[PDB]
Write a protein that holds these residues in place. Structure first.
Motif, PDB file in Angstrom:
ATOM      1  N   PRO A 281       0.984  43.348  58.937  1.00 10.19           N
ATOM      2  CA  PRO A 281       1.070  43.666  57.610  1.00 10.19           C
ATOM      3  C   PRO A 281      -0.037  43.046  56.744  1.00 10.19           C
ATOM      4  CG  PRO A 281       3.024  43.073  58.850  1.00 10.19           C
ATOM      5  CD  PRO A 281       2.165  42.756  59.789  1.00 10.19           C
ATOM      6  N   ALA A 282      -0.273  41.652  57.093  1.00  8.43           N
ATOM      7  CA  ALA A 282      -1.416  41.078  56.099  1.00  8.43           C
ATOM      8  C   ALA A 282      -2.417  41.865  56.334  1.00  8.43           C
ATOM      9  CB  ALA A 282      -1.488  39.757  57.073  1.00  8.43           C
TER      10      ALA A 282
ATOM     11  N   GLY B 139       1.509  45.351  71.427  1.00  6.13           N
ATOM     12  CA  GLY B 139       0.654  46.551  72.025  1.00  6.13           C
ATOM     13  C   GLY B 139      -0.032  47.165  71.004  1.00  6.13           C
ATOM     14  N   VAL B 140      -0.983  48.087  71.399  1.00 10.55           N
ATOM     15  CA  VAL B 140      -1.772  49.021  70.535  1.00 10.55           C
ATOM     16  C   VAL B 140      -0.777  49.737  69.704  1.00 10.55           C
ATOM     17  CG1 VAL B 140      -3.145  51.070  70.530  1.00 10.55           C
ATOM     18  CG2 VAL B 140      -3.328  49.677  72.543  1.00 10.55           C
ATOM     19  N   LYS B 141       0.410  50.198  69.980  1.00  9.67           N
ATOM     20  CA  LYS B 141       1.373  51.038  69.330  1.00  9.67           C
ATOM     21  C   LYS B 141       1.585  50.300  68.053  1.00  9.67           C
ATOM     22  CE  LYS B 141       3.933  54.449  69.141  1.00  9.67           C
ATOM     23  NZ  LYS B 141       3.375  55.906  69.126  1.00  9.67           N
ATOM     24  N   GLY B 142       1.807  48.845  67.880  1.00 13.37           N
ATOM     25  CA  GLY B 142       1.783  47.993  66.859  1.00 13.37           C
ATOM     26  C   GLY B 142       0.740  48.243  65.504  1.00 13.37           C
ATOM     27  N   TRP B 143      -0.502  48.481  66.155  1.00 13.74           N
ATOM     28  CA  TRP B 143      -1.544  48.846  65.248  1.00 13.74           C
ATOM     29  C   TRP B 143      -1.905  50.338  64.830  1.00 13.74           C
ATOM     30  CZ3 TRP B 143      -3.057  44.467  62.991  1.00 13.74           C
ATOM     31  CH2 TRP B 143      -2.754  43.324  63.669  1.00 13.74           C
ATOM     32  N   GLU B 144      -1.393  51.029  65.479  1.00 18.76           N
ATOM     33  CA  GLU B 144      -1.876  52.642  65.277  1.00 18.76           C
ATOM     34  C   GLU B 144      -1.517  52.976  63.890  1.00 18.76           C
ATOM     35  OE1 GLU B 144       0.317  54.633  68.703  1.00 18.76           O
ATOM     36  OE2 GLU B 144      -1.504  55.211  69.488  1.00 18.76           O
ATOM     37  N   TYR B 145      -0.364  52.600  63.367  1.00 21.00           N
ATOM     38  CA  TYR B 145      -0.115  52.753  62.118  1.00 21.00           C
ATOM     39  C   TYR B 145      -1.094  52.529  60.898  1.00 21.00           C
ATOM     40  CZ  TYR B 145       1.412  48.414  59.464  1.00 21.00           C
ATOM     41  OH  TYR B 145       1.512  47.280  58.765  1.00 21.00           O
ATOM     42  N   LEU B 146      -2.040  51.524  61.062  1.00 21.45           N
ATOM     43  CA  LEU B 146      -2.854  51.488  59.993  1.00 21.45           C
ATOM     44  C   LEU B 146      -3.999  52.255  59.900  1.00 21.45           C
ATOM     45  CD1 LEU B 146      -3.226  47.382  60.401  1.00 21.45           C
ATOM     46  CD2 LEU B 146      -2.362  48.711  58.507  1.00 21.45           C
ATOM     47  N   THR B 147      -4.735  52.512  61.116  1.00 20.13           N
ATOM     48  CA  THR B 147      -5.531  53.927  61.536  1.00 20.13           C
ATOM     49  C   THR B 147      -5.179  55.114  60.816  1.00 20.13           C
ATOM     50  OG1 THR B 147      -6.224  52.635  63.389  1.00 20.13           O
ATOM     51  CG2 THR B 147      -6.846  55.008  62.977  1.00 20.13           C
ATOM     52  N   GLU B 148      -3.940  55.448  61.001  1.00 18.29           N
ATOM     53  CA  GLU B 148      -3.379  56.889  60.642  1.00 18.29           C
ATOM     54  C   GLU B 148      -3.077  56.727  59.188  1.00 18.29           C
ATOM     55  OE1 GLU B 148      -0.144  57.347  59.309  1.00 18.29           O
ATOM     56  OE2 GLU B 148      -1.035  59.307  58.785  1.00 18.29           O
ATOM     57  N   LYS B 149      -2.948  55.550  58.503  1.00 23.73           N
ATOM     58  CA  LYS B 149      -2.622  55.561  57.192  1.00 23.73           C
ATOM     59  C   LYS B 149      -3.888  55.263  56.534  1.00 23.73           C
ATOM     60  CE  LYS B 149       0.564  53.354  53.887  1.00 23.73           C
ATOM     61  NZ  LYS B 149       1.906  52.363  53.853  1.00 23.73           N
ATOM     62  N   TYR B 150      -4.818  54.339  57.015  1.00 27.39           N
ATOM     63  CA  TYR B 150      -6.006  54.229  56.057  1.00 27.39           C
ATOM     64  C   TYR B 150      -7.158  54.649  56.686  1.00 27.39           C
ATOM     65  CZ  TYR B 150      -2.848  51.075  53.655  1.00 27.39           C
ATOM     66  OH  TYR B 150      -1.888  50.427  52.609  1.00 27.39           O
ATOM     67  N   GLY B 151      -7.283  54.996  57.864  1.00 27.06           N
ATOM     68  CA  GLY B 151      -8.494  55.788  58.646  1.00 27.06           C
ATOM     69  C   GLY B 151      -9.257  54.795  59.071  1.00 27.06           C
ATOM     70  N   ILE B 152      -9.028  53.570  59.088  1.00 23.98           N
ATOM     71  CA  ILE B 152      -9.983  52.356  59.694  1.00 23.98           C
ATOM     72  C   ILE B 152      -9.789  52.407  61.062  1.00 23.98           C
ATOM     73  CG2 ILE B 152      -9.929  51.187  57.456  1.00 23.98           C
ATOM     74  CD1 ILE B 152      -7.773  49.636  58.573  1.00 23.98           C
TER      75      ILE B 152
ATOM     76  N   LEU C 243      -6.223  45.389  52.896  1.00 18.69           N
ATOM     77  CA  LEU C 243      -6.754  46.759  52.430  1.00 18.69           C
ATOM     78  C   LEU C 243      -6.501  47.249  50.973  1.00 18.69           C
ATOM     79  CD1 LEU C 243      -6.028  48.695  55.768  1.00 18.69           C
ATOM     80  CD2 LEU C 243      -8.355  48.492  54.727  1.00 18.69           C
ATOM     81  N   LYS C 244      -5.003  47.072  50.866  1.00 14.77           N
ATOM     82  CA  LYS C 244      -4.511  47.301  49.435  1.00 14.77           C
ATOM     83  C   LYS C 244      -5.134  46.352  48.485  1.00 14.77           C
ATOM     84  CE  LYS C 244       0.159  47.767  49.515  1.00 14.77           C
ATOM     85  NZ  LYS C 244       0.130  48.785  48.560  1.00 14.77           N
ATOM     86  N   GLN C 245      -5.222  45.343  48.655  1.00 12.39           N
ATOM     87  CA  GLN C 245      -5.734  44.024  47.527  1.00 12.39           C
ATOM     88  C   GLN C 245      -7.160  44.330  47.279  1.00 12.39           C
ATOM     89  OE1 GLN C 245      -3.786  40.336  48.310  1.00 12.39           O
ATOM     90  NE2 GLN C 245      -1.725  41.400  47.814  1.00 12.39           N
ATOM     91  N   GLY C 246      -8.066  45.099  48.006  1.00 15.60           N
ATOM     92  CA  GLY C 246      -9.433  44.955  47.692  1.00 15.60           C
ATOM     93  C   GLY C 246     -10.252  44.646  48.687  1.00 15.60           C
ATOM     94  N   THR C 247      -9.881  43.801  49.809  1.00 14.62           N
ATOM     95  CA  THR C 247     -10.681  43.338  50.840  1.00 14.62           C
ATOM     96  C   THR C 247     -11.526  44.719  51.546  1.00 14.62           C
ATOM     97  OG1 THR C 247      -9.509  41.184  51.336  1.00 14.62           O
ATOM     98  CG2 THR C 247     -10.929  42.189  53.029  1.00 14.62           C
ATOM     99  N   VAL C 248     -12.913  44.530  51.654  1.00 10.42           N
ATOM    100  CA  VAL C 248     -13.414  45.862  52.174  1.00 10.42           C
ATOM    101  C   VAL C 248     -14.009  45.578  53.731  1.00 10.42           C
ATOM    102  CG1 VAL C 248     -15.765  45.117  51.164  1.00 10.42           C
ATOM    103  CG2 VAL C 248     -15.369  47.608  51.991  1.00 10.42           C
ATOM    104  N   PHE C 249     -14.019  46.642  54.402  1.00  7.24           N
ATOM    105  CA  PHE C 249     -14.310  46.668  55.615  1.00  7.24           C
ATOM    106  C   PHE C 249     -14.328  48.069  56.462  1.00  7.24           C
ATOM    107  CE2 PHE C 249     -10.267  46.172  58.054  1.00  7.24           C
ATOM    108  CZ  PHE C 249      -9.256  45.909  56.882  1.00  7.24           C
ATOM    109  N   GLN C 250     -15.035  48.511  57.238  1.00 10.98           N
ATOM    110  CA  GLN C 250     -15.006  49.871  57.853  1.00 10.98           C
ATOM    111  C   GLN C 250     -14.538  49.788  59.341  1.00 10.98           C
ATOM    112  OE1 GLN C 250     -17.820  48.362  56.092  1.00 10.98           O
ATOM    113  NE2 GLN C 250     -16.955  49.137  54.344  1.00 10.98           N
ATOM    114  N   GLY C 251     -14.329  48.454  60.023  1.00 10.94           N
ATOM    115  CA  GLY C 251     -13.610  48.443  61.175  1.00 10.94           C
ATOM    116  C   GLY C 251     -12.992  47.220  61.040  1.00 10.94           C
TER     117      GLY C 251
END
Ligand code: SF4
Ligand code: SF4
Lengths: 367, 54, 305, 367, 54, 305
Positions: free
Chosen positions: D178-179, D204-217, D184-192
């Motif tokens: 969540p943090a 597990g990876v499952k717990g992270w997949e949602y950020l990639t699908e949602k923000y493409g990072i 990402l939503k608050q301005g912090t920048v990064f490509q990976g």
């Protein structure tokens, strides 16, 4: 003028001191309790002129340092409370007090929150502000010894006469003589006291005589010129050797044996003596001055009841400002002095107050 | 923190004083008897006492 | 205020030897508010500052370049007034303001003045050439500008107006040089920001030497003394915009002092102390009564005590 | 073993990185959110090996730093309250949290007041203590991300089974994923993003997949060996250039695509997701874990209602720890770093926590 | 902050592990299926996972 | 911990030239709790420490003097045991404990051991003689004593017991000296309090030189590595009581290393880096993977991370 700053005078006195201290039995610890005095000693580097067996230590001679956090925090609570009641209060406080630290932040931080905090220079500036804004309640966080309690108790008279309504003050005034006593009683040692000049201007020699008669410690109401302190240090070295216990008004040019009776009376009009809390020092009996039951209207605390959080530390871990105010150590005897603690980024009040023993040691880079 | 100054003007309980050359006002609520001839001790814009021929 | 720009030479007088001389190149910006003050204005301040920056490095002012950033809606008379001072001051050196540039920004800011300057020095001087035994000289009263401006802010008025000392002092330096020889002027520093105390500490620190100053010999105006005590600040820590500290070979201490006093801008000049082997990197002050303490450079801009 | 620390491996990777970053369009800012990772990068000085256009910034990867003062102070209030009720409570907390500063003082100061504060190393040590003293209520100020929320929610099961009664915990657990989003939503920048290894062991990876699908990072669940991070930095540099947005389980040796389902379930048993406060960062929605209404008995806050003072600053004047936790600056970009703020005498939590980005920069004396 | 260790003994949900030579106990409330042959990841005295033939 | 005692020489190895040699005089107290630990005890610790204090200054141990302050009610067997170690260790040098003194205090304290020692050095050595290009050598594994004692406190037990390295190393130094000549040993320091990192920083700072160390060349036991990671402290910052850091002329780096390895107490000795002109006063560490970072001396005694 000159005669009071003359290098000739000073070098004669220094010589005389050096001679007397020669036949002295041990180490004499003279103490002063006025910030201005510490500044005088340090600015002219008098200590670099005194014999090895003659020492001058500082006492709680800073009205701002010893101001309890509990009250500073309490004043900020009133600020927020008053606002929560559609009352935008005007806060006036001295330049250094404005920056004094507390676990809840300083008055300067309250300023960075929209509150109207204005740095005044005299109780009058506050008075000037009150009339210029009779819509808002203007309050002055008022700290200070006899010397500053007078102007305040003098402006309250012009407040009672004019029957002014938006002129309040947070009373955290303190009494010098008492603290000196609590100190003797608590272990602090010294063979002579250099009574604060201007504190003696108000309460006169009379106000001090009682300590000599009770503890037999010789005193000297000294001025502030370098020669004034040097002259006073001389007398004390003598009275000590010859066995006397009497007060000597060296500052007679500006002190009446009975002090200014006008101020005395005026103060005694609006304030009543009460047990007070001295930051980093504890509770000193009959050392505070809160407005009498009658003029309960000039005390901003009358209008707002507030709850100050319990367990608020007086100083941050490491700050030995308590020992510095007791004459039990100089600021150079502190592990943080000149390192983590400096006027730019201070730890304890002793480094914030304009009359703080620590700010004075750093400022003049003690040798 | 006071410095000595020569009173150059008086206006009821609102005297005016000079310090080595500075003109600054000074309340007289503590010293009602101040004549422009007198020299006073100013503490936060107030008069606490008058000097002597020391 | 972080020195990132240093590691990202840089940020100090630069020398470039060419022929048998050295080209001295400098630049400094000004955001002085108000643009006007007792005894001078941003314009004079800009030119005087830069000319002096070149004088303390031993270079003769050859030319000035001025870039002004003006905020939209600036009293035109103010700007004209400022430009007059610049041209007026530059001629006092003398030194031509050969080039310029002007920019108008929408931001409300009144004006900023960026000045650059070049000088030629056949015998470069720096605050790192002070030697033990050398004499320390200050060309005039201390605390003028700093106190002048502060007093204007605090209402404090004076019998005879107290004004800034803002002014170029190439003439003062040249005088000394032409009287005792560049080889004999070991170090110089303009006591501007942070005052005399800062200037001395710097020379002391960059020359790895202790400097002893006698409080009784430091020139201070009666107005400055009074004002300094009232505001609660020592005249040693306030800015000077028309003075120069000069460390001279002991054998020329007296000769230099006279040379300075023979000029208008060095009329009150005086010898305030000497370099010593002890307390290297520190500045030791012998008070009027014979006492001793260090003259520490303030941590940040001063406020009334 | 070796292959994961081998200098050969590292120098091949570093070379590969250097090459890729060569044809990179601009500056790539890869971010990690685990303290252990920062320690890995700094200890082996990986940054001193990466190209000028490849940057690695730290995120809120410290469970202790982001723990709100409000809760720390609240826990101390319970300590005093409980005592005022003849209840002498046993407090267990991690070594660094034990020292974390608050305007009201640290847990260590409560220890210097007679209270029984014991530094544990695992939730179990606390458990061991509980049975060894069933007379007094033993409470554990429990902070931590998924990795430490598991042991705790696992010991509560052994608490429910044994139906133990004097085993309580102050829940200030936090959720990593969540943090990362709030950032990402608050301005912090990064490509990976270099996903925290052990946090991924649990969710597990499952717990992270949602950020990639949602923000493409693009993401990389990396381990902790120097080569692990170097390998992960390589992949991210590629996925960025080639245009992908997928997660890669570099730490597959110790991570199951679905993480440990046992812990997951166990946690979901005693804790429920709630909006939480992250010190110096603000309020992050669905980032906290307070005990469910049912097991309201294991939460020490159930028994004692307390009033935490309002207006308690998160950090002391000058501390830019908020910007350091957001990946908006390194501790060297702080005016107090290495000066007034050091592990000996710290200003902000970032320098106290064992996993604080600042403590790690000082400790290994960053170049 | 975890380090890898070889399990040398198991006793119900209270396995024992070795780290480069240190004997330390480790709860198994998160990994009920741990045989002394397995290598585990210890986090504050607990088992979070088991390694692989990577 | 304030250095008042310094200005009130003092507090460091003292040399007194006499004849054609120099008398080296030292003294150190011990308040080690517990009096006993894996691999040694306060008694051995006392003698080893002082002998080593003299070895790193290039002086041959001539004699020891021991003052013991015993607290009323001290297990007598403990005291006897301690005295045995002292006599046992002193003979390992060899060096006689020519004099002594004993005091009994009512305060409950078990015991304190104050040891003094004198040595003769024809060619004095100090941590201020490191020159650029010189090789840096450590005589053995790093982190033994520190980790040994900490592990005993935290229950941590080891397959084969891990014990302190506490022991005199005059033999190791003498070896090198007699093999390459005192003139060729430029600097030495015993990595005790604060560990190797502190020792190196000191040499670097007192010789105004940068020291480059290769993490891959620093000798560390497999037990120490594991224990260090668990407690969360690096073996570089923990105390060593039987090791010596030696800065040797580059041309004798290889010769010295062999000389050390030919002894029991220098069996694991090795060359860990070199002195450089850059980063004067600092210690630069090249990590195993080729990375670089500074090796900063801990601020205070370490705690698990
Ligand atoms: S220097 Fe600072 S920290 Fe030491 S007592 Fe004086 S104010 Fe307290
Ligand atoms: S160094 Fe200190 S002060 Fe700067 S952010 Fe990191 S902890 Fe805050």
């Amino acid at each position: 003028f000159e005669a009071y700053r003359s290098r000739e005078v000073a070098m004669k006195l220094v010589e005389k001191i050096r001679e007397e201290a020669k036949t002295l039995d041990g180490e004499i610890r003279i103490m002063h309790v006025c910030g201005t005095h510490e500044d005088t000693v340090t600015r002219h580097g008098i200590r670099s002129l005194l014999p090895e067996n003659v020492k001058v230590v500082s006492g709680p001679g800073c009205p701002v340092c010893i101001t309890p956090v509990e009250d500073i925090v309490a004043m900020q609570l009133i600020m927020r409370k008053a606002r929560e009641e559609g009352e935008e209060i005007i806060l006036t406080t001295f330049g250094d007090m404005y920056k004094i630290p507390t676990p809840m932040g300083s008055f300067a931080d309250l300023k960075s929150e929209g509150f109207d905090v204005r740095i005044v220079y005299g109780i009058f500036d506050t008075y000037r502000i009150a009339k210029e804004n009779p819509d808002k309640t203007v309050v002055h966080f008022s700290p200070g010894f006899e010397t500053t309690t007078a102007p305040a108790a003098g402006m309250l008279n012009v407040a009672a006469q004019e029957e002014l309504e938006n002129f309040k003050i947070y009373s955290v005034h303190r009494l010098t003589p008492p603290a000196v006593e609590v100190l003797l009683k608590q272990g602090t040692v010294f063979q002579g006291l250099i009574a604060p000049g201007h504190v003696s201007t108000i309460i006169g020699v009379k106000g001090w005589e009682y300590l000599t008669e009770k503890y037999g410690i010789p005193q000297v109401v000294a001025g502030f010129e370098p020669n004034d302190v040097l002259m006073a240090i001389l007398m004390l070295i003598r009275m000590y050797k010859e066995g006397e216990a009497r007060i000597i008004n060296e500052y007679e040019r500006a002190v009446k044996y009975e002090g200014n009776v006008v101020a005395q009376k005026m103060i005694d009009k609006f304030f009543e003596v009460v047990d007070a809390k001295w930051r980093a020092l504890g509770v000193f009996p009959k050392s505070g001055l809160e407005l009498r039951k009658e003029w309960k209207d000039f005390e901003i605390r009358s209008f707002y009841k507030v709850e100050v959080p319990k367990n608020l530390p007086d100083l941050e871990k490491g700050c030995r400002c308590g020992a510095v105010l007791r004459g039990l150590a100089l600021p150079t005897d502190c592990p943080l002095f000149g390192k983590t603690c400096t006027p730019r980024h201070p730890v304890g009040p002793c480094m914030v107050s304009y009359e703080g023993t620590c700010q004075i040691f750093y400022k003049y880079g003690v040798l | 923190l006071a410095v000595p100054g020569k009173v150059i003007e008086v206006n009821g309980p609102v005297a005016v004083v000079d310090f080595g050359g500075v003109k600054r006002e000074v309340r007289l609520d503590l010293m009602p008897d101040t004549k422009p001839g007198d020299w006073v001790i100013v503490h936060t814009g107030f008069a606490i006492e008058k000097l002597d021929e020391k | 205020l972080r020195d990132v720009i240093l590691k990202t030479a840089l940020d100090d007088g630069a020398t470039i030897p060419f022929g048998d001389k050295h080209i001295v190149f400098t630049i400094d910006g000004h955001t002085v508010k108000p643009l006007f003050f007792p005894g001078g204005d941003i314009g004079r301040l800009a030119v005087s500052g830069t000319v002096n920056d070149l004088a303390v490095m031993g270079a003769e002012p050859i030319a000035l370049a001025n870039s002004m950033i003006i905020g939209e809606g600036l009293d035109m008379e103010v700007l004209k007034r400022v430009l007059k001072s610049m041209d007026e001051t530059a001629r006092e050196v003398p030194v031509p303001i050969v080039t310029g540039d002007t920019k108008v920004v929408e931001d409300k800011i009144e004006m900023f003045v960026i000045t650059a300057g070049i000088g030629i020095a056949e015998h470069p001087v720096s605050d790192a050439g002070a030697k033990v035994g050398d004499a320390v000289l200050v060309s005039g009263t201390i605390g003028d500008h700093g106190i002048a401006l502060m007093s204007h802010r605090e209402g404090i008025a004076f019998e005879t107006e107290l004004k800034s000392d803002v002014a170029p002092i190439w003439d003062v330096v040249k005088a000394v040089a032409e009287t005792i020889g560049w080889e004999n002027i070991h170090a110089m520093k303009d006591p501007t920001r942070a005052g005399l105390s800062n200037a001395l500490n710097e020379i002391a620190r960059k020359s790895n030497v202790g400097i002893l100053v006698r409080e009784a010999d430091i020139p201070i105006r009666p107005e400055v003394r009074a004002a300094s005590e009232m505001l609660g600040i020592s005249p040693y820590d306030v800015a000077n915009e028309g003075k120069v500290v000069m460390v001279v070979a002991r054998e020329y201490a007296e000769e230099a002092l006279e040379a300075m006093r023979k000029t208008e801008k060095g009329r009150n000049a005086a010898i305030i102390g000497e370099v010593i082997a002890d307390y290297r990197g520190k500045v030791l002050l012998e008070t009027g009564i014979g006492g001793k303490r260090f003259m520490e450079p303030p941590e940040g801009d001063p406020v009334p005590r």
